[PDB]
Amino acid sequence: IAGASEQMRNDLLLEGFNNYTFLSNGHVPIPAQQDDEMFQETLEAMTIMGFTEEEQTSILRVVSSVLQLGNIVFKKERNTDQASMPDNTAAQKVCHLMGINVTDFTRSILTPRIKVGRDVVQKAQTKEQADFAIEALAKAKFERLF
Amino acid sequence: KLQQLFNHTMFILEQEEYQREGIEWNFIDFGLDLQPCIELIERPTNPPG
C-alpha cells in the first residue's frame, strides 16, 4: 500500500491505508523502520535471489487479494436469513488477483452445490455461514502463498 | 405431482426472493397452488385425499 508505484498501484489494485477492514488498529507504525521504503528494499532483495521479472508482482498480488477479501460484508437480509453480499470490488479486486472463476466464487460463497452423503447437494448459505467461510478463504490464501 | 413442482419453482419462491434483494418488484399472487387437487389425492394429514 505504501511503496506502490502508480502503474502497479492501479494494477495490483491499491486503495489506501484503512480501506481494508482486516487490517485492524488502523495502520500501526513501527519504530525505526518505515514500511514505505521497506517495500522497495524487499523488491530489490527478490531480484538478488532471482525472483522473476513478473513473479515479484505475482507474490505481491496474492498478498493484495488477501488484503482485499474483507470488503465482503454480509448484511442480515432478514427474509430468508440466508443472506448475501452487496459490493463486488470486495470480490473483484480479490478475483482479478485470484483469476479463479468470478461467477462461481460467489456462487460457491453463497450457494454450495456441495455434498451430503456422496452426491450433489444445494443450499443457500445464511448471513452467518457466508461470512465465516469467506473469512477462512481470505486467510487460507496467504498460507497457501507462504 | 409434476405440476405443483412447476408452481412452487416458478411463482411462490421466485417472488419471495424478489422481496429479499432490495430490488423493486411488488408482490402479485396468481392463485396457482394446485396443491388442492394434489391434496385431494396425496395429502396425508388434515382431511386426507
Binding site: 437480509e77 453480499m85 459490493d87 473483484q92 | 413442482l5 412447476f6 434483494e21 396468481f30 396457482l32
Partner: protein, 125 residues
C-alpha cells in the same frame, strides 16, 4: 413404513426432490384434439390445457421479473478484454466500476437488475 401409493409418491420424490435440486427444463406438450387427427385444433381444449398447465400465469411471472440470478463479477472479468479503456486509472465499488464497462458496452438499466448481491438477469441478457 411405505406402500405403493406412498412408494410412488416417494419414487416420484427421489425424482421430484432431486429435480427440485436440479434445473427443470420443461418440454410442455400440448394437445390440439382428442380425435387423433391431422390438422384438428380446438382452441377451447387448448385453453383448458392452458389453465391446466398454468400457462398464462407462467407467462405472467416470466414477463415481469428476471429468470436468471448471479452477482456483478461475471460482468467485470469475462469482458475487460472487450473494452480495454473502460476502467481507467483508479477503482471504486464493484457495481459502479462494472457500470463503467457496462455503459461502455451500452448495457441497459432494466436488462440487468444490479441488486444487492445479484444481478438479476432477464431472458437473453
Amino acid at each position: 413404513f411405505r406402500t405403493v401409493g406412498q412408494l410412488y409418491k416417494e419414487q416420484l420424490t427421489k425424482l421430484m426432490t432431486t429435480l427440485r435440486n436440479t434445473n427443470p427444463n420443461f418440454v410442455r406438450c400440448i394437445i390440439p384434439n382428442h380425435e387423433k387427427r391431422a390438422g384438428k385444433l380446438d382452441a377451447h381444449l387448448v385453453l383448458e390445457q392452458l389453465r391446466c398447465n398454468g400457462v398464462l400465469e407462467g407467462i405472467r411471472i416470466c414477463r415481469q421479473g428476471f429468470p436468471n440470478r448471479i452477482v456483478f463479477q461475471e460482468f467485470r472479468q469475462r469482458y475487460e478484454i472487450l473494452a480495454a479503456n473502460a476502467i481507467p486509472k483508479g477503482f471504486m465499488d464493484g457495481k459502479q466500476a462494472c457500470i463503467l464497462m457496462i455503459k461502455a458496452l451500452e448495457l441497459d438499466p432494466n436488462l440487468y437488475r444490479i441488486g444487492q448481491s445479484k444481478i438479476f438477469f432477464r431472458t437473453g441478457v
